Amino acid sequence: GFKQDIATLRGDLRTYAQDIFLAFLNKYPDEKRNFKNYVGKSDQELKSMAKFGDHTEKVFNLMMEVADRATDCVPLASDASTLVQMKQHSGLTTGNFEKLFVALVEYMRASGQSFDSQSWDRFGKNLVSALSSAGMK
Amino acid sequence: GFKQDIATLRGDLRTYAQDIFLAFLNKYPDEKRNFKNYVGKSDQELKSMAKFGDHTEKVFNLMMEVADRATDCVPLASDASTLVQMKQHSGLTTGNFEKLFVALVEYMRASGQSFDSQSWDRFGKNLVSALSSAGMK
Hints:
globular; 68% helix; oxidoreductase (chains A, B); homodimer; 137 residues; mainly alpha
């Protein structure tokens, strides 16, 4: 289930984080606009840029903690506020997160491993709702 | 306290894992023999190698799972048994683990961050006790 999936991801987190974030950026090319240093690079080139590896691992380090603290796939309101207030995420909207979680669920469905895809989809929609309630456009 | 400390470490797990493991290997140079690949390499050389980061992150990910499942800094017997039975821990003794936790607590006390160093000391001693009860020499 969802709790075991958190442990599976954490067990190889650097690999999963880069693979999932690349699937996001390739499914939604417009989303690279937000990074700008990522344009014109192939996946293997991004995987050798310091700011790409470090940002993606910190994204998923925190996302797994938010997932871990959730009740029934519903995140804590304090975790949603933390995500909305980070100066880095000024100028982001719930749509950027929605698209990230579409890519994540599609990656899990294609992977062949025993992920609880449907729980991740619910978690993503509930996170988006909490971000809005916390003030994000 | 202890639970917050787990969240702090998990937030930047690769960085903390490398720095703490290097402190261990440099405080106890004889322990570096258990890692034939790491002999004859400076700290920056080790951080340069992908295998080093991957290994130290996987060590500390499991340590944080064991810490999170503990009650009052006492690990589950089942978690200790796992650590005893792992192939890669063949030939290890409890003294190896004791030394790792001395280095961890010292790193925490010197870090200038608000770690609960006393709880990590207690957890390390209780884990060494559990490893012996689980069969480790």
